[PDB]
Amino acid sequence: GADDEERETGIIEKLLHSYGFIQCCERQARLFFHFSQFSGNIDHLKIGDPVEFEMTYDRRTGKPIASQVSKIAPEVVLSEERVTGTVTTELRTDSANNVLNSSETTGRISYENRGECFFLPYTKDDVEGNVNLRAGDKVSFQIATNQRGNLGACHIRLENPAQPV
């Protein structure tokens, strides 16, 4: 996919009435968004709140607009349980020019917990911190349960590394 999609993140710096500003802090774009382009509780939107929005060119009116603007992790609960897993399979990125471009590759994390033992598919684009984990080290990931009941591995970062000295 990815033929036409721009998932961009921003911070609400100042709320106006029926109008607002998205800050370029995490993305090189300052977009003004209207309250009709916001999905969720506007009364649960605050100054300093980070949101994810889709940047698209509306060919209808001929103006650049934002999509429904999704609050980052609204109904998605981190299960209130932080777990750690052992990397059992890596994914090939981090080339001499491109990285994370190949989203058709995924590794595996094995975590043994709650009597359950199974491998979770993970990609590098969800790996926060921009680290380079390697199979055999120990990483931490937050199991964020979406309202659909379907989830995977998210917030994957390298906490306790295994470096061959």
Side-chain angles (χ1 to χ4, degrees), residues 87 90-95 99-100 122 124 127-135 137 139 156-158 161-163:
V87 182
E90 305 168 353
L91 62 159
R92 67 168 191 103
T93 54
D94 320 315
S95 72
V99 59
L100 70 84
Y122 84 102
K124 180 175 275 85
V127 176
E128 56 168 73
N130 294 329
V131 307
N132 204 265
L133 69 172
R134 293 291 168 138
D137 59 29
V139 299
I156 310 172
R157 77 174 77 111
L158 180 61
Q163 303 181 271

Side-chain angles (χ1 to χ4, degrees), residues 1 59-60:
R59 305 295 68 180
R60 176 185 177 211

Side-chain angles (χ1 to χ4, degrees), residues 5-165:
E5 62 158 278
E6 296 300 331
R7 62 185 75 185
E8 305 195 22
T9 48
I11 306 180
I12 280 65
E13 185 70 69
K14 205 286 184 60
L15 286 177
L16 292 308
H17 297 134
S18 189
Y19 180 75
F21 285 100
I22 296 178
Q23 268 297 90
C24 49
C25 178
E26 295 306 305
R27 174 65 169 177
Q28 312 89 331
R30 299 186 304 168
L31 292 181
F32 53 96
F33 76 107
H34 291 265
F35 283 11
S36 184
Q37 278 64 86
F38 180 67
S39 173
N41 274 85
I42 186 60
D43 57 305
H44 287 229
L45 184 61
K46 54 183 296 181
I47 292 73
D49 194 82
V51 300
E52 178 180 79
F53 55 91
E54 173 182 59
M55 207 294 178
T56 44
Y57 293 107
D58 176 89
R59 305 295 68 180
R60 176 185 177 211
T61 188
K63 301 171 184 294
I65 58 173
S67 194
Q68 72 298 92
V69 178
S70 305
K71 288 263 299 186
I72 300 181
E75 189 67 39
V76 194
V77 184
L78 284 66
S79 195
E80 302 178 71
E81 193 177 304
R82 178 179 177 175
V83 297
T84 43
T86 319
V87 182
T88 49
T89 304
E90 305 168 353
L91 62 159
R92 67 168 191 103
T93 54
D94 320 315
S95 72
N97 181 266
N98 66 85
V99 59
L100 70 84
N101 182 266
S102 314
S103 43
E104 56 188 277
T105 183
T106 175
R108 289 299 188 273
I109 299 174
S110 189
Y111 87 112
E112 296 75 52
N113 178 34
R114 294 301 190 160
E116 297 289 70
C117 53
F118 55 90
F119 303 89
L120 297 80
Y122 84 102
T123 49
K124 180 175 275 85
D125 68 282
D126 201 276
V127 176
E128 56 168 73
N130 294 329
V131 307
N132 204 265
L133 69 172
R134 293 291 168 138
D137 59 29
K138 199 60 174 294
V139 299
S140 187
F141 63 99
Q142 282 57 268
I143 304 176
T145 308
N146 183 27
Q147 191 181 31
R148 263 298 190 126
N150 175 266
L151 51 291
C154 192
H155 287 283
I156 310 172
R157 77 174 77 111
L158 180 61
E159 302 290 44
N160 291 328
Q163 303 181 271
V165 181

